[PDB]
């Protein structure tokens, strides 16, 4: 996260770290959506142009974390993966369309003060909140700058951007399965997700029921926090039918 700040303790209890077993390193962010299911970006697991194709045994999920590098004894919980499910129409060839994946855990994780699931949006909450100017929140342990790494989980609040402005900021083909967020050059603030924040959640707090909803997944961006560029996020609601189908079939 670029130009963010340190998270408060328990501020994002659905935040998950995807952790590579060998060599031990941060792979991506992710989010907890139930006691057995974790949501992330497909490109965290599968991206052939960069020779990336992780299997279940390659990875661990670490839940309840705050510190990036330290083993948070008595606080974090570490889970093994039972199965990875990548969206069957994930477009790694072109533009990361449908950049979404689910991971089923081998065993349920116990919720605690530091470990708790986020909600997935219904149609109405999505329609109400996914509007230009409305702010969401991104969290992660990714780079502090495009070109280092944070001691603890970082957080930044960012406004959703008008679709034509998103489209006009890039040569990449944007789809309805994406949205973009960030400040414009003219505005007096900045901030962005970056490498390593990939797969983590873009959340919004519903003013109707005071619950946090995951509207987006950190997907892609041209550099990080560049003037005139925006961060792009997988549109979770648009892909919720697939999420439901996977959980109903394999849950």
């Amino acid at each position: 996260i670029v130009e963010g700040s340190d998270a408060e303790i328990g501020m994002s209890p659905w935040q998950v770290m995807l952790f590579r077993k060998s060599p031990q390193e941060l792979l991506c962010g992710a989010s907890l959506i139930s006691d057995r299911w974790v949501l992330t970006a497909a490109h965290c697991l599968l991206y052939p142009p960069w020779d990336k194709n992780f299997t279940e045994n390659d990875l661990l999920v670490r839940i309840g974390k705050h510190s990036r590098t330290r083993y948070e004894r008595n606080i974090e919980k570490i889970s093994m993966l039972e199965k990875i499910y990548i969206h069957p129409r994930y477009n790694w060839r072109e533009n990361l369309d449908r950049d979404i994946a689910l991971m089923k855990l081998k065993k349920p994780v116990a919720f605690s003060d530091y470990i708790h699931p986020v909600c997935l949006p219904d149609r109405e909450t999505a329609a109400s909140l996914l509007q230009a100017g409305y702010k969401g929140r991104v969290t992660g342990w990714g780079n502090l700058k495009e070109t280092g790494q944070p001691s603890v989980l970082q957080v930044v609040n960012l406004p959703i951007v008008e679709r034509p402005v998103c489209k006009d900021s890039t040569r990449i083909r944007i789809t309805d399965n994406m949205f973009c967020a960030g400040y414009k050059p003219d505005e007096g603030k900045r901030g962005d997700a970056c490498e390593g924040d990939s797969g983590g959640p873009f959340v919004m707090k519903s003013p109707f029921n005071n619950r946090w909803y995951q509207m987006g997944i950190v997907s892609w961006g041209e550099g990080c926090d560049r003037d005139g560029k925006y961060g792009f996020y997988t549109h979770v609601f648009r892909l919720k039918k697939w999420i439901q189908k996977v959980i109903d079939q394999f849950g």
């Binding site: 408060e8 303790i9 328990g10 501020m11 209890p13 959506i33 919720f111 605690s112 003060d113 530091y114 708790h116 699931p117 986020v118 909600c119 997935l120 909140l129 509007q131 100017g133 409305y134 702010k135 969401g136 929140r137 957080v155 609040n157 406004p159 919004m204 707090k205 519903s206 003013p207 005071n210 619950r211 946090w212 909803y213």
Partner: peptide, 27 residues
Amino acid sequence: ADCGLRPLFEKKSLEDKTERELLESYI
């Protein structure tokens, strides 16, 4: 059923330092 309600915030009626920024953006 309990999704999206944080034990250290919503569950104990405490606000985090910047959530108000989000609310203020929601017309």
